[PDB]
Every structure is written in C-alpha cells, then in structure tokens.
C-alpha cells in the first residue's frame, strides 16, 4: 500500500547576528549544554565535505533514550546545513535541513526534517512527528534564551 | 627601587573527567556563556603552536572595561594551558598557567596569573589581585556549575 511521508517545520528569531548564531548552533562540543535534548555529541570523524557524530538524548517523560548516527554537511557560505541517519533503526530514513535567515533584529533559525518511520517502530510516523516538535521547539527556545544572553556585553 | 610583582592562585575541583573539562575551558567559542567576565573572546590568528586572541570584559560594578589580546598555548598532552599578554597596556606583563589534576571524582582546575601592574596604571598590583581573584572565583564556579549540569546525562 501507500503512505504519507512525515515532516517537522519549526522556526525562531534570535536576536543576534548571522555569525553568532551559526557559530553557536554549529559547535557540537557544546551541544549538550545548548540542548536540553543530548546528553552527548561526538564526532566521529570528518568525512571531509561534513563529518558523522553520534547523538543520545537525555530521557523523556516517559523514560526513553534515543542514540544514533548522523552524517552532517554545514554550508556557511550558504547559510544552510543539511544532515542525515545512517544507521539501522526505527527510522526508515530522515533528514534534515536547516536554514539561517537575516530578519529585522536578528536571525530567523527554520529547522526542517523530513522522515519516515519503520513499520512496527514504537513511534509512528504520528506519535513521533508529535515528539519531534516538542524536543525541537524547546531546543530552538532554549539555545534562543542562551545565545541572547551571551549576546548581551553589559552589565 | 625594588618591588615584588604579583600573582592569584585559584583551584576548583569540577565533577568531570579530563576530556570534558579541557574540552569545554579550551572551547573559546564559548567563552562569552562560560565566563560571566567575557564580552568577546575572538581568535584572531594561530601562531602554528599557539593562537592569538582578543577579549574584552563585560563592564564590572564601578563600570571599567577591560580589553586585551593574549597569546596561548594550550597543551592537552601535558593537561597544561600557558598564556601572556602582549599589548602596550597597564600591565608591565602577565602570564597565566593552568593545570588540570585529577582527583576522585573530578577534575582540579588551578589557575596561575603571574604580572606586575605599570607605574600610574589606574590599579595597582593590591588592586589588581584583589579584582583578578574576585573575578577568577565566580568564573570557575560558574564553570564548574556549567560543566557538571551539562555532565548529567538523566532527567
């Protein structure tokens, strides 16, 4: 039979320039301080064009832990970055693509992904695309407040 | 006539291995939401064994901005991070040192500042230990603070 694929779009202004905010979003290293959502961010090794780091998240509500790989291509001079699962799990594949845009006052992050869930996957493509906003929205709030805050050089 | 020059000497000890603290404390990216005291950390050329960077302080409680380029030289190999200033400032000279020990449950961070205040500089070395120590103390505890929330991988 046939079936719809799933997607996410979610977006936030920061309130801070083109550089920070890339430089910021782009450093894994402090990933799991900028992401309530991961525990852990490391790469593992530079593919040259991008590089592959693995990501595990901290429990949700419920207790569950997710872990997997993903191939990520950063594009400065574009404004944009783009990345993809490569591993075996629910995710029969997905990916992302996020784009940095110059606003009044500040840069509008659009985070975009794109997927589909395995049959029989705890999560289908429903509940997951449910669960992805959620995480997304606070991460995109979240890394809003920090780099807002670093922005600020007074007082 | 004669004088002694001055120096600070702080320790925290962070609950965290080597790897994370090195990595995050070597992380300048992020120095402006690690250091309360940091406006602007920017790496401005990497002299091959080191690297040269400006800062410039957020302004302390009488209002003074601080602004300087330094040259340092961090090596994990030894866990040790050396550093000097190199503008025409009020310092005669300064140079930093920093260790990490490890010890149950953690990691020692101690920092060293080695210098001398120029004739007529509006502090002199009384002063300036006693704002460098102020300064360098509620930096390592927000570092510390940071690294080990970041470090919790549960709920």
Redesign the interface.
Request: aromatic share 0%; proline share 10%; hydrophobic share 20%.
């Given at each position: 039979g046939s079936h719809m694929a799933a997607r996410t779009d979610n977006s936030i202004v920061v309130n801070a320039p083109f550089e920070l905010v890339w430089?910021?979003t782009n450093?894994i290293?402090?990933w799991?301080?900028l992401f309530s959502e991961y525990?852990?961010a490391e790469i593992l090794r530079q593919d040259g064009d991008g590089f592959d780091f693995r990501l595990?998240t901290?429990?949700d509500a419920n207790?569950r832990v997710w872990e997997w790989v993903s191939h990520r291509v950063p594009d400065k001079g574009s404004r944009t970055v783009r990345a993809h699962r490569v591993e075996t799990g629910p995710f029969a594949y997905m990916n992302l693509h996020w784009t940095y845009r110059a606003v009044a006052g500040g840069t509008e992050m659009r985070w975009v992904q794109e997927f589909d869930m395995k049959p029989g996957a705890p999560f289908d493509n429903a509940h997951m695309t449910a669960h992805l906003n959620t995480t997304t929205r606070a991460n995109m709030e979240r890394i809003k407040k920090?780099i807002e805050?670093?922005?600020?050089?007074?007082?």
């Open positions: 430089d910021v450093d290293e402090a799991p301080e525990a852990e595990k901290r429990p207790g920090i805050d670093r922005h600020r050089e007074g007082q």
